[model samples]
Target: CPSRCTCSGDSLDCGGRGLAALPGDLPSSTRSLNLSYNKLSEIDPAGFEDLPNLQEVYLNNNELTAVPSLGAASSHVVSLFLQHNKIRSVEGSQLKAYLSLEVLDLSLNNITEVRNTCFPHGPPIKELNLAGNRIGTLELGAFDGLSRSLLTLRLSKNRITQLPVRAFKLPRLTQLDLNRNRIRLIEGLTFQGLNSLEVLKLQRNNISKLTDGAFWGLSKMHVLHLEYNSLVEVNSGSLYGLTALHQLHLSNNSIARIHRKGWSFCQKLHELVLSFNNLTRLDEESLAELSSLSVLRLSHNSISHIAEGAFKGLRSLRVLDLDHNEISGTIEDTSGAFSGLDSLSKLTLFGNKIKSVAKRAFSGLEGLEHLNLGGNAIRSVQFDAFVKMKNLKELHISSDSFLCDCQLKWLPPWLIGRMLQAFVTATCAHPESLKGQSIFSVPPESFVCDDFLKA
Candidate 1:
């Protein structure tokens, strides 16, 4: 139709028409080509030989500065989106005649420098995205010419400070996004030849240090995103050879301490995020080799100590997030700090500063179901502290400073006999004639514990 551009079957939508050139009536059965938001800056590889069914191509948000070649008989191009371009690197020299280029997105771009011949070895590029580039200097072997068919390599928002150690020899890479880079330290062989890596995103890197083999040779990594970072400590030779890790994000790190061999070679980690760290204490050999941890996030740490068996060998923990820690003296003194968490069901001590609940404070959490002693100021709770958890369905002990005497009278008829009096909002702050009561409609004979003043 007057070259306004928008064909049906073969696809060819000349995007954002501020047409600066190149739309001279063409469509030779175009396979796909939307000249992205134009102000087109030259793309004449003989103007794509009348679109010989070009295999997917969109000059993404263009003002394209480099890397764009559809020449050598457009070698059946396959997926080429020049992401938000003003591209100033990767001297695209006839991308090895497109030998079927596989997914290449030049992300954001104004690329600082990645010159290792800016990708030239032959072409079978699997997936390459130079995430928001201002990429400082990733030159080493800048993707050893698509190391024989690369596999997902997104260099996240870069200005990469220093990271050139055995610079990627991609062994058919799996996934390596260096998220938000400015790498502070990651020395030890800085990811040796990526031996078929599996997933390694250095999340928001300001990474303080990880030298000891900084993820040595990455043996088929499982999933390791060092969450946020400035990691204060986490030793095991800085997590030596991740031995097939399985989700190990040191959540928003500044980790005050966790060194007793910090999870030796990650015994097949199964989810261990030490949330917002500055961890005050969690000793006992810093998490006894995480016996195949099942989900253990020590939430917002400043943990007021927890060394009693400190969750021994986490025998496949169920879900134990010591939410907002200060483990109220391990839950009001002498609680075996949750003896070996025997398959703990779910235990979140919601923001702890707990007032009192000592009858062996949830002894060994009898297979606890879900326990959130809701933001404690809890006055007293002695008698059989939560009747042997039995499989408690859900207990978020709310409080108005309960001292509901008679040792909290077996807790409102044992929370209405197991029905758990609606997640407890236990009131009555001691004597003054039961001030503003309601231990869930009290009067189990008024729960009298007379002596009145000094025991």
Candidate 2:
């Protein structure tokens, strides 16, 4: 007499009434079991045999085509929410009598194939959500008996195109969500037995290239999300087995170049996301093996040029995002262009077309701290062009078209007492009678070059 069964205490709320079966006086010390939004197509493995204190089992939004063998009363089941079911196939001997299962949610099902004794004996599973499946192919030992306690493997929005070569021999996998997916190619030992993989989400995907060792056994990978994709170039042992890689998300992509045997072994890279992409130029062996790079995002890209010792050896760089880009040059063709980046402290040359700035164009940036030359076309700036940036603290030369004459008379006494808050809407693009005024409300003798060159 199942009138929408709802017995508390031992728990068993036959979810969303529209029932079809499995509801018969189920209260004999039941231990959590909500037959989710039901119209349950079929589930008679003796209907949980005899709920011997079942431990959590919510058959998610069901019309379950198959996956019912919770027999011997789900031998103390330990979490099992069969996600939005229409389950295509998932037979590990029908979950070998639950033996205290540990979290197994077969996500939004339509799972193509995964048989290979699904999870044979080893079932102390620790998080295995086969995300939005339509799994293209994975056969080969599929997950070789949950290789020593699965640690978190969500095959992100699947339709996986390729991946066979130790294909997830899950050696205690530590987070492996194959982002979006339709993975083009990653052959060589295809993640050779995930040696405790630590976060590896191949974003979007249609992965263009990365051959050599293609991440051979992910040496304890530490965050590696190949953004968007269609990578144009990066040759030189293509990231040869990331040695403890520390954050690397190749933003958007169609990456123009980076071959000087790129990143000679990621030396514990500290954040590097080449924004947008199609990078034009940046010498000194272009990022000479990022000696412990610290946050370097070459914004928008199509970068004009940088040559002169182009940032020699990152010397532990600290935030350098060349915003927008098409950098026009000056500052004497980028004098030493940030030589050995003495721990550069934030430097974003906003939307470039830089006209002039030479006075040793910021020689070896003395621990500069935040300086964004706002939307550039800078007429001139040689008042010791920022006097060796002695710890400059936040200065983004607003819009810029500055030409208030007299060679800018050393910019109103070096901007008086600093902190001009980006100089209020700075104006005066030239000597046309203080043209558009507001260069911080003029009057510093109106930049006195003989009274602004005889008004």
Candidate 3:
């Protein structure tokens, strides 16, 4: 048994001991060794020579300047944790000894560039975490050695500026995380070899462009997180081969337009988030191909135009969030604007500049159950404007700009009768006698409109 270390069956715990040197009296029965949280600047090559039973080792949180080789015991080591170390370089010849390594975490290190010679086809490593490092470049074929076994490659929180074309040839890689990098342009066929990739997270990058066929081979991808980037437009050519994508999050981008066929290949998408962008218009056929989409978030945009048949093809859509947009014209002038949303249930127009509600503004939303018009200075909602929604359960309208004339007489009584008055805070903005008065407290006689009132 090693002195100053505890032994638990086949495991040895020499962690957190502040020992500068490795213990010499390690038992041969040790299958798991914990040498982590030590002052280890280096390990003697003979320290692990006789441990044939060593399978897992925790050398994490140490002062190791390089990846340690387990000497003669390297072949059978399966799980190695060297995270939070000062690892500056990794040699291919040294890693070639570990023939059975499956999990290798060298994250939070000072590695700057991953040379193509770092990993040269030896271990059957499934998970490799190089995150929280200073990696600025990924040379071609840097990961080709583990193409057959690598499933998850985490390179987030790195300084990677670009990805060389066909750099990752891992057909078995399912998750490739490149978030918080400086990647700006994604050239075509950049990710062509990843045939089984399911999730590609490129969020929090300075990504501004996606050339054609950028994601061409990611056919089986289910979710793509490109949020918090600097993208300006979404085109069909840039979104090719993503037929199986279910959720696409492009929020917090600079996207100003969605081409008419931008979503043609993404027909199977169920939820798409484009909020916090610069989108100003929803042209007629812009989103016509996303019929399977249920939740479409365009909130926090400058959308002032909703072309007459903008939502004609979104029959499967259920939730449409248009909050914090300039959609007053669509609500006050346009009829049949929401023409074909036959399955829409919740429509939130909160935080918009809608002042008037025309009767036919919500023409095709007959099946809508929850409608939120809160935070708008709504002046008048023509007769039967909301009563057309037969299945309406809650109506959130907190506006003190209601012109409570005879046209709005049915609101208070109808709201109370349907038990939806709890969510509405309608008040009068017109008529000198009803100023500063809640609509619920005003009588039916006070709702009369003067003949001299301007239209």
Candidate 4:
């Protein structure tokens, strides 16, 4: 029966119970203030004397460890969450009395170091989280006079392993997470003054090597993660100039060898992960001059064989993970295995040990969608296996072993009613009474009988 913190119009939740302070008359036309969970430890520097049109202050979880001095109020606070709590330190005059702060979360807490005038004021910070915390040394002007209207700076996990190349001036940073942390080494101009960066997480950490003008001038980067880390080799000017990069992950790491001009300056790349590493082959200049490539994961590494012009020019390739790896053979002239992908769509080749697929072997895949070829060891499927996918949608060809004779008995009247939707367990390896049904649910006039004639 004690509900009366006296807040009238706009918004004020005063959260659960014993609210330590801030209730002297909160209603200068309040504009959203939650005071979260409650028991808020301290903040009485005139505890919001009379929220003069406050904007948003959630005082997260509770008991803020420090930085809560809102004196001479009425700066029209913009947005402050003060996450989890128990914040270790955050000087810079506790944000120089919010001169219209934009957005600051201060995730979790116990921030170890970042104090060189901890973002006092200026351009109006756009979004800054400082994730988790315990930030291990990052001095170099520790954000010299910030707020050039920053876009986003998370500072993932933390305990950052040396990164003071003037911490890249932040030319209006676009998105930088710095995943995990303990960054091993990164010399080359350390991200030359981020010219409007564009999403760079730097996955896990302990980066093994990557010194070749280390991301020089980051020409408007576009999504680069650098998967797990501890990379083995990627020499030949590892991603030299990064011409407007476009999504490059470098999956797990310990990359065996990639130096054939290792990504010659990533010419407008288009998604290339290089799955679990230690690749055994992928010659043809291991993806040089990616003319706008489109997805090439290279599944679980150690690829068995793929030598002939290993996907030259990658004609705007589209999704080719090569599942698990160790591929076998039997594609004599399936149109020369993926003939310069005519915008190939999807060709996973699950598990591998492929038996056959010769006929026009996917000649220039025509916008293929989902084709895993389920854990191969396929018995056969010639008959122009997938007659130049007109627009194949989904075809995993369950765990292999499919041989419905009569030279493929016209595959259910060429999928009579081709609105394609097969795979009700796609069976049939010899006719033990077509065991357990579903060969396109049989019965498209039973393929003109005559023992399902062919020839």
Could you say which candidate leads in TM-score?
Answer: 3
TM-scores, in order shown? 0.38, 0.37, 0.94, 0.36
lDDT of 3 by residue, 312-405 (tens): 8899999999999988989999987798887899999998999998888888898999999999999988877876789899899999998888
Please write out the lDDT profile of model 4 over residues 224-259, one tens digit for every residue.
898998888767565776788899888898887676
Using lDDT as the yardstick, the better of models 2 and 3 is 3
Clashes of 2: 0
Which model is ahead, 1 or 3, in terms of TM-score? 3
Q: For this target, which candidate reaches the highest lDDT against the unseen true structure?
A: 3
lDDT (Cα, tens digit) per residue for candidate 2, span 1-455 = 24667776788788988888877766557888888998898787666656677888899989887777777776578888999888888888778777778899999989887867777765677888989989887788777687778899888888988887677677888898999888977767688788888899988888898787788678889899989978887666768878889998988978887765657777788888988989898776577777888989989988888777677778888888989878866354557777788779988888777776777766787898888888876766676577777678778776547777667766755766566455324577777778777666677666745554566
Off by over 4 Å in 3: 1-3, 6-12, 27-31, 49-53, 451-455
Cα RMSD to native, each candidate?
15.0, 15.1, 2.3, 15.2
lDDT, each prediction: 0.81, 0.79, 0.90, 0.73
Total clashes in model 3, counting residue pairs 3 or more apart in sequence or in different chains: 0
Candidate 1 residue spans exceeding 4 A from truth: 6-33, 36-44, 48-92, 95-165, 169-188, 192-212, 215-235, 239-272, 275-296, 299-305, 308-320, 323-356, 359-405, 409-440, 443-445, 449-455
> Residue pairs in steric clash, candidate 3?
none
